[PDB]
Amino acid sequence: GLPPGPLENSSAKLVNDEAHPWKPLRPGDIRGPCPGLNTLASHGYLPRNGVATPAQIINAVQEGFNFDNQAAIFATYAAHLVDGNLITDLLSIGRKTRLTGPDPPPPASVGGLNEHGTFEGDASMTRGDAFFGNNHDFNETLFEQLVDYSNRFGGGKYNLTVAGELRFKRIQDSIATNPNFSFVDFRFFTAYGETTFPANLFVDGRRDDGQLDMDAARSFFQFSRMPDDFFRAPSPRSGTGVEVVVQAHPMQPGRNVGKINSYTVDPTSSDFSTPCLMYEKFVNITVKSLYPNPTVQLRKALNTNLDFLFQGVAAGCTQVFPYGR
């Protein structure tokens, strides 16, 4: 289906309402590394089993949290291209599942959002790096560190100042302990933007003050649960204030090189000075490597989803065509 358009009415409103109650997981229900999508699934904005179409995801993030349309489109189609089934039009928000349908040939994995190194990556705030055994479940120790950083830099609340400090701490801890730490290209971008999301989108929209309390933070991050009487944000947004996070501790893209404490800058990586390069590499390298010589129906589905992806790219970039026009 076509990517949904922006909300017709983007005002703050109660989104923890009678039609969207929180419910606990049933056997088989999938949750993954994204507390936003997890919460939407657990309130029935998405299918409660955690398997959805790109159109369902875009509608849910807009309706439930007032995520902006351009950001919704880019993130959703990027995730779907690398982790979803392009023939069935289904994506798991967590683990790989037979529910997304018959798989394409390798090297495409259709591994859901839990797939390491496609969309998901290292130095997440409340999830551990994949090297340490689990890149998707809520981690209490990491959450308590978020609480500590909120106490130290946010007066007990999570805000952009806290984000700036915690983002850097998680990078430096991965450098020190994960010999396979990777922090380039698509992950380098998403790792920064995601740290703004709790301040921009988990804060009740009647306040919209960028100060997230720890009871609400735990409810979303651990339980995929909106606070009682939760109002969504009062206007469309995603990553506003990411400049504050970057400015706190500016980093270059790079990786550890098979050993701890060996962070080596990658000059081939995109960075914030080259946002169109991030898009071009994502298509030409990441997507193309998963689908190097697709058959007829796959090629068509790739091109459709790549056209939708490009709708989410900030104006100024040139579309690239790995499988022709």
Ligand X SMILES: *[C@@H]1O[C@H](CO)[C@@H](O)[C@H](O)[C@H]1NC(C)=O
Ligand Y SMILES: c1ccc2ccccc2c1
- Confirm if 175 and 254 have CB atoms less than 8 A apart: no
Percent of the chain as helix, strand, coil, to the nearest 5: 40, 5, 55
Question: Least distance to ligand HEM from the beta carbon of 227, Å?
Answer: 13
Q: Output 2 or 134, the one with its CB closest to ligand X.
A: 134
Whether 67 and 201 have beta carbons less than 8 Å apart is answered as yes
Q: At what angle do helices 214-221 and 140-153 cross, to 10 degrees?
A: 150
* Binding region for ligand Y (CB under 6 A) out of 2-10, 69-77, 207-215, 247-255: 69-77
Taking each helix axis as running N to C, give the angle between helix 69-83 and helix 296-311, from 0 to 180 degrees, rounded to the nearest 10.
150
Query: Least distance in Å: CB of 10 to Cl ion?
Result: 7
- Does residue 115 belong to the site contacting ligand Y (CB under 6 A)? no
- Told to check if 168 binds ligand HEM by CB under 6 A, we report no
The least CB distance from residue 113 to ligand Y, in Å, is 9
Q: What's the CA gap between 323 and 289, in Å, rounded?
A: 12
Say how far apart CA 308 and CA 248 lie, in whole Å.
34
Q: Looking only at residues 129 through 158 of this chain, which bind Mg ion when binding is defined by CB under 5 A?
A: 135
Q: Is 323 in the site for ligand X (CB under 6 A)?
A: no
Q: Interface with ligand HEM by CB under 6 A: which range of 120-128, 259-267, 288-296, 303-311?
A: 120-128
CA dihedral 150, 153, 156, 161 (to 10 degrees): -70
321 counts as binding ligand X under rule CB under 6 A: yes
d(CA 33, CA 128): 10
Binding-site member from 10, 97, 118, 124 for Mg ion (CB under 5 A): 124
Rounded to the nearest whole angstrom, what is the least distance from the CB of residue 240 to ligand Y in the complex? 11
Residue 65 binds ligand HEM (CB under 6 A)? yes
Give the contact letters, 255-294, x = binds to ligand HEM (CB under 6 A), - = no: ----------------------------------------
